[PDB]
Design a protein around this nucleic acid. Sequence first.
RNA 1: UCGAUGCAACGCGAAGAACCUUACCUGGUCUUGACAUAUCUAGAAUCCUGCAGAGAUGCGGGAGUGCCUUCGGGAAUUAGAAUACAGGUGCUGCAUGGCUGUCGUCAGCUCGUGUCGUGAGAUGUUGGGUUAAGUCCCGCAACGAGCGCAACCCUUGUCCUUAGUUACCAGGGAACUCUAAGGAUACUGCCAGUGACAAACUGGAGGAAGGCGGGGACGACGUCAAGUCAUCAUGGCCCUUACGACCAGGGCUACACACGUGCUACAAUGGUAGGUACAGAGGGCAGCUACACAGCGAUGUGAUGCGAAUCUCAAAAAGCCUAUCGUAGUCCGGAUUGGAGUCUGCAACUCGACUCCAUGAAGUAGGAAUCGCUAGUAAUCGCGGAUCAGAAUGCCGCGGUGAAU
Lengths: 100, 205, 100, 80, 126, 153
Amino acid sequence: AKKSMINRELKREKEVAKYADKRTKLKETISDMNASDEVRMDAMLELQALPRNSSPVRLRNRCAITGRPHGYFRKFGLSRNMLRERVMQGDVPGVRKASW
Amino acid sequence: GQKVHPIGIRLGVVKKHNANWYASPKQYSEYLINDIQVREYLRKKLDSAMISNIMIERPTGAAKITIATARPGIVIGKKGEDIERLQKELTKMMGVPAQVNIEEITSPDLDARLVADGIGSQLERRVMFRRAMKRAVQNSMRSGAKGIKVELSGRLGGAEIARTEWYREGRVPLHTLRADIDYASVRAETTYGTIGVKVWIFRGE
Amino acid sequence: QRIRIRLKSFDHRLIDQSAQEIVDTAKRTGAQVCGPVPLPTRIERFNVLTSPHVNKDARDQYEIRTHKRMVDIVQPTDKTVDALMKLDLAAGVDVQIALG
Amino acid sequence: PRSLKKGPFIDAHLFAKVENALETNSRKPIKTWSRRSMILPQMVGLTLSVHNGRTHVPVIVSEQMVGHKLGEFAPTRTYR
Amino acid sequence: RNYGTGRRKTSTARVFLAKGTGSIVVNGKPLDEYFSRETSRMVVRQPLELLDSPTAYDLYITVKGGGISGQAGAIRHGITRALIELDDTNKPALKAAGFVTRDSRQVERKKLGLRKARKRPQFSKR
Amino acid sequence: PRRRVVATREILPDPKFGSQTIAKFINHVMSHGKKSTAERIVYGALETVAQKRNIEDPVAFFEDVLENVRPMVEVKARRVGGATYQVPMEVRPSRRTALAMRWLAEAAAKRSEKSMALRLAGELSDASEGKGNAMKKRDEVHRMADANKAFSH
RNA sequence: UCGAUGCAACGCGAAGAACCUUACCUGGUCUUGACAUAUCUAGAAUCCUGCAGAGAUGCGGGAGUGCCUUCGGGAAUUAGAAUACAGGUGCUGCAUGGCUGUCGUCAGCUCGUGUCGUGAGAUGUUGGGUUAAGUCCCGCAACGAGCGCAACCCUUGUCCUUAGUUACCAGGGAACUCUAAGGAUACUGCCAGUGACAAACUGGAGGAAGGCGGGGACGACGUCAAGUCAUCAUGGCCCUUACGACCAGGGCUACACACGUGCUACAAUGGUAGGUACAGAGGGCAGCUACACAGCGAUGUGAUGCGAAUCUCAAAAAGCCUAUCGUAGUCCGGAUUGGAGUCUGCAACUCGACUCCAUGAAGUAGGAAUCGCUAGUAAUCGCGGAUCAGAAUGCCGCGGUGAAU
């Protein structure tokens, strides 16, 4: 993909890493039943006031090598194209052609 | 485009993976990405010394990289001062010590990657493709390969229409699963485009 | 003190020898050991499109097996534990120790 | 729709524009792009200018439009 | 106490032959209660009855896996394996019936691009 | 196929009569691989006709109706130099039984009785005396064979 | 938005568009730039903040002073000072590499030497058989070889051996199933015939398996200037305060229409309501949840076990027994619409999936035409997984029942 889009994913993940802990504590606060109703309402208001890219939902998994969004595998972290290239070269441990 | 990778189809029957570690489903992706990064860095850096079989096996953080080259002397350096820099550069972009222990190819005419990269270098030196191909065939055959096939594909000699040429000597039986066929595919960036070089070296059973 | 060693790898002919020498070194030190039980290997399959653009009908089917073995030292000895801690096996096989 | 336990959703930036509009009791059409904010009876009576992708079409809010999202009255596609 | 092991497409059964009245207990339950299929009941009781001895041997079957008819086939195979144990003269008759052969038929795998093992999608010339 | 003649499969008999003929008819009634449903349809039909006709052994009655439905001469298309000739030929016994069973099932599938088992029993009864759509189809096939009766190639 | 266009485009790239993805439109913005190297000015980076704005961004206040060498200072680091440049999913698949489809898993396709012909070429490779096969045998101016076929690989079918937990239960046991490694067997091996004294074929025994036991992967030389410059790489052409870059909203989801793939049906071989059974495979800390309570339900709260042969997803459904419906546009069908909710998520209007109540549309078997399938197959029934915060009727698999010819 475009170098701009790769850097855009990087800067989108930077904010996620920067606000990872704040989101966790705030989420526990808003889901706390013992917490006061106005307290959890204000905490949720802050959560909706957080910067947009801080959410781990706007993150799109991309191939590490090519940056391709479509055809991604979590276990390997690469798009289907270069995944096949490296498996066939033998660079990917354990993985081989299957038949049954 | 109708042929299976000779290495890949033989990955479990007679060949072995050139990456021998184990990971957990979550750790495996980052191990693989770091592995590919190290491989591309090595293949760009040691582009002078003819390395062909960099193998990555990482036991519990510490890794044991094993590069096999036809010219270990140049890549090791004087008293071993280039190898230490390579060691620390590997360690910097991996986790913890990457012990790179370096093998030696005692027959560079039987390794497909060395043959392919030699033909590629000759092609980028504006050498006749037919002569480079025939020279590689002769070299491998008289060095003792039971068979060699070399395919040159692209705008050969500046030709506007790309074409595929190839020479075969010996057997090189691709469909035999136990055939011990080394295979390499490289590219020569000439002044008219990319010329693909494929080399099959069949060595036994 | 009944220790349990658990071996997990991708190569099935690596765990066989890894467990073979573990059981041999734990039975040659005057200790009784039960043979390496094999636990059901996990096979993960992947469907990777081979064409770079189109014709979804063409794809490679890959698999990765995760083989697992287990050995138990029913009665341990000091001459078994010392010889076991020196048996530094790695590079392909994960070994987990129950230690009890 | 949404969850009742979560509560009504209104964007903070437009909620500030209406807390700076119902005290003042102005009739200036508040120009907004957040179509994802639900009309609450707090600003019932006044006017907003909701972006429909191309322009900021005017929506005068009424008494029977509360509970809806601001975009419901700003169609984006043109059939004919 | 003759012991037989029978196998079918996915079910595996282990049968225990012992001379008795003719009662058959499958998975700690009577055969009729276990098998609501009349065909399955016949399939289980067939190896006993082709050679004219249904009420001669007590059977203790334990089945696992498979389906209602796969388990019946597995029990038939195991009963044949146990019958050949007490007497080898019954083996020719069992072979002529075709009960000693283990049906190797298995579910054919689904292939790539095919909707099933062999079912392909609709084809259009245009 | 084009080269060999396959060895036919063995069909195990029906559980409640022990007859491969009734088993094969149960197969012809079957759909979606439901042996139990087909078997109860056929058994309901058989018990209905047996209780109505006061016959102790109905397998012989089924053989009688089957041989009554079976045709003997079927018309086959032949090609001789571009001419399509409808030559009447004999029916091999396996095809005889298959055609009879298929005709019985397809005729019983279109009647007006409430249950399919009742429909099948009524059709068996009707073809026993010599009526019903199975009989009409057999008569139609015989009619075409006799209508040609002029090509003995 | 772009590509794919006869077979071999049309549930195709896309293994999953609310934002993101995103490549398109509207508007708001930046110009060595979001990203690499050359550089010199200050600072450890880094953290917490206020306001304005839709956000990108803009203007301000506090804490910290790294580490090794030490007064040259260095791996990283924030804001530019400028030239190189970067960047481009912009164009040319008819300049290309790599990758793929397809004829076609069809049995072919060639070469060396010899010989024949002025020659292009021929022979071999043709012929008699035989085979799934240029498979094999015998003939034969051919003699040989190579890539293809076959075999070697994986899975399943029987047995043996090592092993017995978290697996198993015949009498704690080391029997059995199972699990997962290593092997045994199968070779036309034996018998009878037919066959050129052949290859081979036909039948039979034994055996779990008989002739290629079943399934897969493996795709020759080449053909379509076949597909892909939008995975990637790359020759050339083109744009560099813009065709590059950032943000918000919208669109990719519009529908007089047409076609391609499907799903659900049109019911009685069925619908509904009660009981009662029988799987496999796969997933689970980026989680699955025992159990209890609350709720009509989706779900919610507490809590337990489990990185799993231990705990869980999870109950398999079709099936069987009883009752009922009794052929009706219905107790069939479940679209569409109204209302009220639950989750995921900053956010469900455009434009989510489920839940509940109400509604109840077409549809009663489908024209010309046309498709798949030869056995555990078709048909039918459920169950998993990839992608994935959420979002399968698609894709990839699993087992159940199970034909006709």
